[PDB]
Design an enzyme around this catalytic site. Structure first.
Site, short mmCIF file in Angstrom:
data_model
loop_
_atom_site.label_atom_id
_atom_site.label_comp_id
_atom_site.label_asym_id
_atom_site.label_seq_id
_atom_site.Cartn_x
_atom_site.Cartn_y
_atom_site.Cartn_z
N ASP A 35 0.84 -1.20 0.00
CA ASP A 35 0.00 0.00 0.00
C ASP A 35 0.87 1.25 0.00
OD1 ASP A 35 -1.92 1.90 0.29
OD2 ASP A 35 -2.39 1.42 2.39
N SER A 199 -0.62 15.60 -11.97
CA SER A 199 -0.86 15.25 -13.36
C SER A 199 -1.10 16.51 -14.17
CB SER A 199 -2.08 14.32 -13.44
OG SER A 199 -2.47 14.06 -14.77
#
EC number: 3.4.23.22
Length: 330
Positions: A35, A199
């Site tokens: 994770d 992004s």
């Protein structure tokens, strides 16, 4: 040193991926959910409340000659889905794919919430976010990667998750045969303890690319892709009959639909998520309403590039002094 381990979907939907981890001496192999959005290595154990164990493999520290109770240490964690676990702490030898760390903090669960009990395929979590998020008290502990870093050939790990298929976690090296083209690296903020990056925009299907900054985290422990409501609405508007369902908890779409791809930007590069990766199947057995793999982050507080996005790429988690992320197509 290096390590390399195969990671395998737990079910036919790629809801999560499990990777075998050797703990203790002799080794006890547990299948952990790696994770990158948390920083605790915790396991089902011989200390877990018996009624809360249902098919998981447990770690028994009393059977490990290298286990040592970390005196006074406790841990307690709550995840974004509202699940939780807590317990005490041992140090022990932990190996992943041939890479061994001695003295790793292994957090033994005394209590786990129902969602963990109900998932017999996940024996615990191995956190790969920054150690500042580790919950052990009163002495915070380091992640497996942080402990291994100095010994690794290069201070990196890579995630290569499969679509409906196994993939690979590598530690200490970048497998140049595992991706196409080049890896584009992008800046990371560690201020919140995550692999947080920005992004450069998105496209829906064959549509034009929208240049827009989307701050989010690279999170292998989250199944879906959670993005701003504007982006998510633009995606689902291209699927006839798709709608946001308050009762189901997100966007659903007719199972008869063909889904468009979704592209996200990494610098000037582009990662394409095929439409099929966005199908999470019937909302309930036999339903013709299917659950979408791109959902709004509006109720989270952060955008999350979960497995839906990451499995479309070869992803480098560069843990150099100034960390960065790398993405390549594959």
């Amino acid at each position: 040193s290096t390590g390399s381990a195969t990671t395998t979907p737990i079910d036919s939907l790629d809801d999560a991926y499990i990777t075998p981890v050797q703990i203790g001496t002799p080794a006890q192999t547990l299948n952990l959910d790696f994770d990158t959005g948390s920083s605790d290595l915790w396991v089902f154990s011989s200390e877990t409340t018996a009624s809360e164990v249902d098919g998981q493999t447990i770690y028994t520290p009393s059977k490990s000659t290298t286990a040592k109770l970390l005196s006074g240490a406790t841990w307690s964690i709550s995840y974004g889905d509202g699940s939780s676990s807590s317990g005490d702490v041992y140090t022990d030898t932990v190996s992943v794919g041939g890479l061994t760390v001695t003295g790793q903090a292994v957090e033994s669960a005394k209590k786990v919430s129902s969602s963990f009990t109900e998932d017999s395929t996940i024996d615990g979590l191995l956190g790969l976010a920054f150690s500042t998020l580790n919950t052990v008290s009163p002495t915070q502990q380091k992640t497996f990667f942080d402990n291994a870093k100095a010994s690794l050939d290069s201070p990196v790990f890579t995630a290569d998750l499969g679509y409906h298929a196994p993939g690979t976690y590598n530690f200490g090296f970048i497998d140049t045969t595992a991706y196409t083209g080049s890896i584009t690296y992008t800046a990371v903020s560690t201020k919140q303890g995550f692999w947080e990056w920005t992004s450069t925009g998105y496209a829906v299907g064959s549509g034009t690319f929208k240049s827009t900054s989307i701050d989010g985290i690279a999170d292998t422990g989250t199944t879906l892709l959670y993005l701003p409501a504007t982006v998510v609405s633009a995606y689902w508007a291209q699927v006839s009959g798709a709608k946001s369902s308050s009762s189901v908890g997100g966007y659903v779409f007719p199972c008869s639909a063909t889904l468009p791809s979704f592209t996200f930007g990494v610098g000037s590069a582009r990662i394409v998520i095929p439409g099929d990766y966005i199908d999470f199947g019937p909302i309930s057995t036999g339903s013709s309403s299917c659950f979408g793999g791109i959902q709004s982050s509006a109720g989270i507080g952060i955008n999350i590039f979960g497995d839906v996005a990451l499995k479309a790429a070869f992803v480098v988690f560069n843990g150099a002094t100034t960390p960065t992320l790398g993405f390549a197509s594959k």
